[PDB]
Design a protein around this ligand. Sequence first.
Ligand SMILES: [Mg+2]
Ligand SMILES: [Mg+2]
Ligand SMILES: [Mg+2]
Lengths: 706, 31, 613, 636, 34
Amino acid sequence: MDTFITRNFQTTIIQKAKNTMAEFSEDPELQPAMLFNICVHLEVCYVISDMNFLDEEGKAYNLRPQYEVIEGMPRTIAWMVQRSLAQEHGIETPKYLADLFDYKTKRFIEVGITKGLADDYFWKKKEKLGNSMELMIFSYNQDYSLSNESSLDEEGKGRVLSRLTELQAELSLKNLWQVLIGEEDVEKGIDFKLGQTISRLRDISVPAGFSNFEGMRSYIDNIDPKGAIERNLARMSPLVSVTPKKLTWEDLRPIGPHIYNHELPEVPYNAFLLMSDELGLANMTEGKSKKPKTLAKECLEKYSTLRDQTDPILIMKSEKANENFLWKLWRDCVNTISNEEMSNELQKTNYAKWATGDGLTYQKIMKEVAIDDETMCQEEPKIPNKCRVAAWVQTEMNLLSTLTSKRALDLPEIGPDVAPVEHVGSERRKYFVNEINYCKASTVMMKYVLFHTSLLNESNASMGKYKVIPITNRVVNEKGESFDMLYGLAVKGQSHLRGDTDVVTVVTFEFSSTDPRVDSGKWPKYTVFRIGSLFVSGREKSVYLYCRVNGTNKIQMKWGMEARRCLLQSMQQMEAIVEQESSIQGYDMTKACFKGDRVNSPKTFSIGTQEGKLVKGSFGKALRVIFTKCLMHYVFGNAQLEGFSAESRRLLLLIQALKDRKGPWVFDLEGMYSGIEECISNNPWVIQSAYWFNEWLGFEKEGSKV
Amino acid sequence: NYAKWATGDGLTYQKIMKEVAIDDETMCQEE
Amino acid sequence: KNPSLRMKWAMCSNFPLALTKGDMANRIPLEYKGIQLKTNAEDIGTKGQMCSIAAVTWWNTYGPIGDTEGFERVYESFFLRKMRLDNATWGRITFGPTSAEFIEMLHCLQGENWRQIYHPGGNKLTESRSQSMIVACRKIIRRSIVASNPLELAVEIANKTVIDTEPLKSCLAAIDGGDVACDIIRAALGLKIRQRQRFGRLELKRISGRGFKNDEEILIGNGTIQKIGIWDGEEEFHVRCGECRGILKKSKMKLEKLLINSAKKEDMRDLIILCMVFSQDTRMFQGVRGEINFLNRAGQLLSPMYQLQRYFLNRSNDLFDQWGYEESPKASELHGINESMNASDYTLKGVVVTRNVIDDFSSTETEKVSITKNLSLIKRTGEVIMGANDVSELESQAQLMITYDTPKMWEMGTTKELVQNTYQWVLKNLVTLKAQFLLGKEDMFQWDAFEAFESIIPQKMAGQYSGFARAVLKQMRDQEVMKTDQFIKLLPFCFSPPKLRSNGEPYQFLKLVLKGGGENFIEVRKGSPLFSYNPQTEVLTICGRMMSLKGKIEDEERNRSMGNAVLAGFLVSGKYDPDLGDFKTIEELEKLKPGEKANILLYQGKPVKVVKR
Amino acid sequence: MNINPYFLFIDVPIQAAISTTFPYTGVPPYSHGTGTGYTIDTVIRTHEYSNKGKQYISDVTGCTMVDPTNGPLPEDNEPSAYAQLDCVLEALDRMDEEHPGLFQAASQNAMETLMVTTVDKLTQGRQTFDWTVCRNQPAATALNTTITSFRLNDLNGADKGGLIPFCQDIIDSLDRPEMTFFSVKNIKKKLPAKNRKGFLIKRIPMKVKDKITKVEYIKRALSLNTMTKAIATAGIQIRGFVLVVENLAKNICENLEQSGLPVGGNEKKAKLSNAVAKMLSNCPPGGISMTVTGDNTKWNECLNPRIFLAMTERITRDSPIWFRDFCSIAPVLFSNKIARLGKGFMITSKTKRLKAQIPCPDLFSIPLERYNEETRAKLKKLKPFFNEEGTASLSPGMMMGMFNMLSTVLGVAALGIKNIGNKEYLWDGLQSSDDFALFVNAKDEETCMEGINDFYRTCKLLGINMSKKKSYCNETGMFEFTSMFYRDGFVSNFAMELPSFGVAGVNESADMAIGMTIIKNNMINNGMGPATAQTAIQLFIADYRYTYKCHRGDSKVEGKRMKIIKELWENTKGRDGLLVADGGPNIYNLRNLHIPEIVLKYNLMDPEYKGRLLHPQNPFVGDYDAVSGTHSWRTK
Amino acid sequence: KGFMITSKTKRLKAQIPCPDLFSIPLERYNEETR
Ligand SMILES: [Mg+2]
Ligand SMILES: [Mg+2]
Ligand SMILES: [Mg+2]
């Protein structure tokens, strides 16, 4: 196809046809028949126009031709030339883009290539166009139909017919005559009519001041609107204004001051799993993958005292919780895990139905009965509580950014680096994983991801019963030892539906060494038992069991599984920082930022305050803080956090403009602040972010004066 | 279905196993 | 709506894959070594047989070997893409502010804030000898640059490098072509090279004038003071760059005349920019509005002239903008070029293209230059002609296999070729290594092979690994008989200075990790994907490349337990006594008081007991 | 020491520090604005911004219609839907002046593409409303159902293959006195139960011949349903015409330097840089150039379909009348649209522990005192526009993204005025439908603010409402456009759809290609960095090996297939040529993400392994680039 | 048989048998039964 097109047509015709076809077809190469038609049409047009010449007064021999070729050029310029000719010569502009313009009679010319016969395609073109432009019809077989006598003569006809004959013969003898398509099929559809309903609907879709659509059409087609915008702006009320104001540092006030109100409750912990208070029971292994039930069984065997504790020492109780139900559920989970069966089904399903609260679900009734029942009313929405800053969020940020002795990240390999960009990426990854491998946040993220993976895996055919899903992880220390860690056990409820959004109840019992009574305001959602004591390095630490009835769904399970993308998010943020640093220079600044070169010292960041004094740290500490921030943003994500993060960006950019001395201006600062502050109700991350923003804004204000 | 709720036959307390009833402190005898 | 989860569940099924019918479909065994590969089920109406993914694995492992002729013909586009990628040359990656063969690499070429220079290749095979020689010389220069006394390292590596089968010295002496790196190596080996001044890619041969470089403090566009040696006096040179040549007449901080011929557009641009930078024009000095702190691979700071050269090669528009313009005369031979190297009378100030052919200055001029310690070539007059700074930074793959028979270049491996070379060298010199070890001498740890090995040990843990290995070897030598396999395994790690903890004892380890982990680790007490040994068959499998160990092994180092050289300071005693407790972690072994006992698990099925000394 | 993350801003520019603040671009699992309450809120808001305009009763459907166009000018800074036709026409006329032949070229190109389009193209969209079942169904299913039901009604246009005959049938079906169709019903039929009664009631999706009247069909055709998995979906009767209207709008948009919606990847940064440089170069000597990062309030709720009908009329002025009529249909059908309000509300008895869902038709069947306060107010405001079928009338406003290209055209037309009253300022900008950046060059910041005020008022005149609570201004050289931060040449992204986790689920041969192509396109278009891309490759390889149980052959992993993979590892000499699915090593990196792994490893494959893998007679075989082999198997 | 205990808010009921009469705290009975 491309071979014949290349051979039988010169390069200019082929490229012009390709350009013409690419304007309306987005898959030019998938249909070469249209290319054949267009290139043949252009060749014919050149044949008509190339050889016929004219002169100044009347000589049909200077350089003036009597034909102007409007085809083969971009439609934007073709339309300009067509309109210019029509206006200059005092003739009407056809609604279609003509192929030629004849200067002897000053008439637009349409030329067609009929496979079947002329005088039939001629009348189809007449129907489509009408009396707007003359027609020249030439057929593959010797035949023609011209609407004028002074038009193309016999000499051009011979060349065009011979050009058609050669292509016809080649197509016949190269098996490509089956690919040919007539021009008619490209014009298919010009007889579009409007019925009686659509026309009437159109009549009542016109703006105010128009009776029917015909009046609107004529008004748009005939009225010159010059001066309308200024006419309407002159008579517009002055109260319609942006009211700009030059922003200053004194205009930037702390956001959400109510978080400093001590008459409010402090935000309680509400994440799915314990992050910094987690305690995992560790059992060395050889790295072989194990079934979750077997891992839990061996971990509980290693700690028999905790496993065999059959009496509850209640330390804390949630207001609406039943400690008996929770303890019996925990004992059922332990017994199920320790049994020799290969199934994680709970033995006491009837009891677990009520222990999890699944039996306390309202009963759907006929809408008619509810309509007659005057006591059935729509429930008021639950307004999120307004809480104040809690120190446990700061403590969580401090602890999760530290380095531990265990790493849960073991990623596969990639091909060797051959390009400098590949080496840049490899060095950046080396530094990132060196700083992030043993971060506590990494292990917490891996635990979350594995728990949600296990939760989703158990939703194939086990959504109608009660299962026990161990909370497990696999970690490795600097010495190469591998440990299986059991952080607790969760019982997964059962939704009779399978809609991907129906709530499934998960009761989680997580080990911890944290006394709930040290920070009472953090744990109102948890009921805590003291299940025993543990020895780690000769020190006895109390082991409590935090029990909580939470809920989720397949969508939330998938989101928690996807929580592993915090690693990629932190990698991208680090790359953005390093690329900003290297934009100032012309070379990569990864080593300079991290280790420091001879010319560049190791980059330092401001990481926090110690008694109101700024504290600096390395890029590794900043990386750990970035990773922890991403993980906490994901874990505590909700509508409030999404809104807060999307809205505080504008304030941050305004502060950046103030720092850069770009003279920022604002139109509604109080509106910005209200939009930001409407999201600070009870999300721990949002409240802590407001506190941190206020502190950093105070520091930026103090630094602006110096 | 309408007659079930119109006559009050649907507003009947549902029996549960004695174990959960014993464990539940909010289940008390009616005066 | 969950294809990933659905596929994960399906792969856990028994027979999820549809299997066709025929003789080949009937060549799959019903079950292989207890694994059911194809279902023996006759469907009622569909008659659809099923198989497990294990069936696909079995076919790939033991199935009939079908003909594989003409496969490359069918998938010719993919193989052309692979060939284009493999033959391409990579330039430099620049940060801050199109043929279909480039759109293929768009992911690796263009970033939001970075740009990678990429020269596509393909079927440039004829002159493989010179290309491979150039690549080898460039690699040798790069390796030797970062080492103290670069000249000695370069000469001792160039003598041990072979392209295909001919020694690099022969290639240099015979081909006579090459580039700056080839000339540097030629002079390093004592050969002769053509004499030309080098400024980056610019080759200059003076033909009239004189210069007397003087130290001065110049100001640049970005507003900094730089100490530069400026050249004064009217001088004229014949300049060349790739396929373009010209004549440059310059004076103090000014380019008077720059005649050139028509050539490759990129070559034209490089020649013209390098000519401006060499002219030391103040008009050029004022165009520097970024930061010039460019370094070299050695980590040192480029001299100001090369700083400007790199800056303006990266940012050419910053100079063509601040270079002015003029109108060239309408003479037929004479022309002018705009910023895009087109035909335009609106030409650059002092730059002019010409039709007449300028005779190439590369007349045979084989001389003997003197090379300094830092790879700087100097005439008999004492004027530096070329140096390491002028070597091109382009990187490519050689068309002929080059091998550098020296540990210094082992760093160019994949961290698995490096380990392979290190352990093969250890095995080859095993007898002499052990003989020297059994003398109270520890110089063996300083060998260049261990130098190369240390390049893949995590700098953070290299000292601890070395201390552990040295302690284990000392225990295996002095207080007890040695185990050959463990000695070989732990000898390379002994290089780095010991980093024993405050207690004075080494750090106990279970595995020793290397760069590019996941599978690149050495098990201290068990076989590893990188180092395994058969105690009975005397076979040392390094990366699956089994090598025999007959003779070197000893009769008495077979009955000895492997647990005598697994933890420093601990010696086996008793047996698997299940009273002390479970298999202790390394943390309790480190914390154990001297004279205490402990339990260890060498591998799956070999418990043992040890005692501290 | 107390760690404050925000202190990272003290050492890094905020543009670089907030890079990829959100690791996703899709709707989170919790920020779902779906339900009857949200739809009713949208209706109330849309009618609130147009309640000072004309109000009448539709003569076709009988609904209450509100026309804000050509209404009184706003007197405050609240969202305004009272666009003036004359101002829109003047803006479009100036746009045509600046770009001669652009309207005609776009009209001709769209018309020709329409003449070449086929009915099968109405299957590449998302879920679409189906009037036959009155439910959201995939585009292909809805198209087939409509074609069959039209055949039932003697409407044979889809068989011809062309889209124009199908659209002709679509608009002619609006005139049929009644429409017959095939409806799928869960018929509780008879079954011989095992019980004594022997009647096991059970359902089945049986197809039956249902019939509706002209008015019911017209209301169904103009209806848009609420989504649960854009909060509205349109039927098949509108997609055919919206396709051509959007094609025309895209033809216009791709030729405007201010349009920035089509752009994606490294050319979006190029667009931002070019705009900034162009505006800086044209600043008066000693003048000031400012940039407004702008947001539009109630963009969809304040744009009127009547204004878009006028836009299409003006653009297609010189086109043949048939194409003008074809183009007018989509805005005509959207100016008479009906909103379906969803499932309804839920009322419960706490004392009785009962619950029941009140459907949309029965919203007013109970006293409003039995709804909570907000819902009671919503229903009080909704009553005038409530049809007694569970639907509401939404004549004004654009529901959600349906005419994004045309809205971008209107915005760019607003940006093309450049001046008011021959004052001492000039404005330009970039438009991405509802997001925009404005640049103002003047002599001082005061005249720049005057120009910004004039632009705000002109936008109000055009029906566009700039957000004062979200837009702001600062000296040119730093701004944000479509979540992309620009600062002194450096460029960053606020959000990035990082690769999901798992495999495509086709087969181990195609999954590798799909994942590598995903990473490649992420680092091409979404601005993924080298380290991030390599980490993504590593994560994908981990997921691949986990899903297909194809860990390395030198690893220690137990399994049915791993047992044979280890034997293949032992037998093979060229282990670097084994595929990952065969336990071989992974050799993918940034440079070779576009090459199939079989082609990559061919030169390293063992002769026997490559013969067996590439066996043309293998019993397993029976976008992305892949090579057929034993790994290109099929699943039932 | 035993005694019937009930929860009104949860609308639950159960029959504590004779053996388990004292299994629950006596405060959960009424005055006469207690
Ligand atoms: Mg034509
Ligand atoms: Mg947008
Ligand atoms: Mg924006």
